[PDB]
């Protein structure tokens, strides 16, 4: 048999192999050097058209010979040397050159191949354009490049809800030209979002079909009822036709997805909110955390979508209010613009008010987000939660937001040496990025504002006042024992420092 180069030669030189050639001239010469057989030669010798003798000569020849020699040593003698010169030149440009073309470009306008055809067919969403988070999309593309050699791997692009992960994935597979074509052959992008137990199988059913040819989508059976071992075997079956295939698993909630992904030895980008699902995988698990949009990236984000930059001091202050409230969050920021109507700083501050005295419902809008409001998103994140963590979280309302505060100061409100509070608050930041850990000076946590104002108009109006009282109580009991700076332990006794917001919270729970 030949190989890719020698078949590239027999295929490339066909425009040529039609104008001047005839297999009969070679049939005897090939029945001779022992690379044909008199039935092979029979098959090629009694053929009506020359295109017949040629197509059978090029098909039939490739099985018997160990190489493409006795066809160069033939066009020479037959005065058809203009062919054998091309082929000897080519064999020289491959035997004699250990460098050719690699997977790169020689048929340009990959603008419609990779950009148009494969992304669209692999269901990759239409990348965002008016703003790109440089750092992250870049680190994604890089860290994906480092791994295309590997047979299977997980990349966890994890963050808060609406933190912007999927969009970054949209851009990382739509920006470069390397990831699809050079580093990976095909793309399959599937939204998971599975909560039910039948979802993790249905997903991989639509994987199995993401694989299947344009042909035999018609033949689709009532495949809904067939074992898991068979769907899996059927994929890794249908996975032969798919050399280096990248898998985006947009929105994973269940670690069962990840277990299937890991049984099927797949290469996965994974957008998710809960980070701990990776413990399901024993493997090169690699991570990229989608942090909150810095105040400045938020500025950039504002400018990018035609938003006027401040002048007076209490306007830049108004906008640091907005960036602070929506604690660096892509989705609610976008909803915010979409809802900023006149565009004025005035109606912008209007919204800044609307957000504290009406919660997230004050800025809910039609947005590129699947969700009317981020509360609709966090909803699920709170449903998935361990019942006890659902509790701890439910109480973390009564803290001060955008303030770093000690564990003992937390042992007071969180249910159950009370480090267990810390364990819950860790799980709580790991699983939807609901909290915020900060190791030293002292093991302290912090609740952001969006993740707070979620809980405000959402936790039981009573449980608020109860947490306020249970805190002022144990604060008093610690009473009894007797900026870039943490609150000292000589001074926990007066939470009155955060009285302003404690007074607001109070007016809420009791009215």
């Amino acid at each position: 048999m030949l190989c890719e180069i020698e078949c590239r030669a027999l295929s490339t030189a066909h425009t040529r192999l039609i104008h001047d050639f005839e297999p009969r001239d070679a049939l005897t010469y090939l029945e001779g050097k022992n690379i044909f057989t008199e039935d092979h030669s029979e098959l090629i010798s009694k053929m009506s058209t020359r295109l017949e003798r040629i197509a059978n000569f090029l098909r039939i020849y490739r099985r018997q010979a160990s190489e493409l020699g006795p066809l160069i040593d033939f066009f020479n003698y037959n005065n058809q040397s203009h062919l054998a010169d091309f082929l000897e030149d080519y064999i020289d440009f491959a035997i004699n050159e250990p460098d050719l073309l690699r997977p790169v470009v020689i048929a340009p306008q990959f603008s419609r191949q990779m950009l148009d055809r494969k992304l669209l067919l692999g269901n990759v969403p239409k990348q965002m354009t008016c703003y790109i988070r440089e750092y992250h999309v870049d680190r994604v593309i890089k860290k994906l490049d480092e791994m295309c050699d590997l047979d299977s791997f997980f990349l966890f692009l994890h963050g808060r809800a609406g933190s912007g992960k999927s969009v970054i994935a949209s851009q990382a597979l739509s920006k470069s030209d390397q990831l699809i074509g050079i580093n990976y052959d095909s793309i399959v992008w599937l939204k998971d979002s599975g909560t039910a137990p039948k979802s993790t199988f249905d997903l991989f059913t639509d994987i199995l079909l993401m694989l299947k040819s344009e042909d035999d989508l018609l033949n689709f059976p009532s495949v809904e009822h067939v074992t898991s071992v068979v769907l899996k075997r059927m994929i890794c079956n249908a996975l032969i036709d798919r050399p280096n295939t990248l898998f985006v698993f947009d929105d994973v909630v269940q670690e069962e997805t990840i277990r299937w992904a890991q049984e099927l030895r797949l290469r996965c980008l994974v957008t998710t909110r809960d980070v701990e699902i990776s413990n399901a995988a024993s493997q090169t698990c690699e991570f990229i955390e989608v942090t909150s949009l810095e105040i400045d990236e938020c500025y950039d984000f504002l400018e990018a979508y035609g938003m006027p930059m401040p002048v007076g001091e209490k306007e830049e202050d108004v906008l640091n209010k907005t960036i602070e409230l929506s604690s660096g969050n892509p989705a609610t920021l976008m909803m915010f613009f979409k809802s900023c109507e006149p565009k004025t700083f005035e109606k912008m501050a209007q919204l800044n008010n609307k957000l504290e005295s009406r919660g997230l419902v004050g800025v809910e809008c039609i947005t590129p987000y699947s969700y009317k409001s981020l509360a609709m998103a966090l909803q699920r994140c709170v449903e998935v939660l361990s019942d006890e963590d659902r509790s701890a979280l439910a109480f973390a309302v009564v803290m001060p937001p955008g303030v770093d505060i000690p564990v003992k100061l937390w042992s007071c409100v969180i249910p159950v040496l009370d480090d267990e509070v810390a364990d819950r608050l860790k799980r709580l930041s790991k699983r939807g990025a609901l909290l915020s850990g900060k190791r030293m000076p002292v093991l302290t946590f912090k609740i952001d504002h969006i993740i707070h104002m979620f809980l405000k108009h959402v936790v039981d109006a009573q449980t608020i006042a109860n947490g306020i009282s249970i805190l002022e109580q144990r604060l008093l009991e610690i009473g009894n024992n007797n900026e870039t700076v943490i609150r000292p332990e000589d001074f926990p006794k007066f939470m009155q420092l955060h009285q302003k917001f404690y007074d607001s919270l109070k007016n809420f729970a009791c009215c």
């Binding site: 909803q379 709170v382 449903e383 659902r390 439910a394 959402v458 936790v459 039981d460 449980t463």
Partner: peptide, 5 residues
């Protein structure tokens, strides 16, 4: 608590 979560 959690008004329908």
């Amino acid at each position: 608590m959690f008004n329908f979560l």
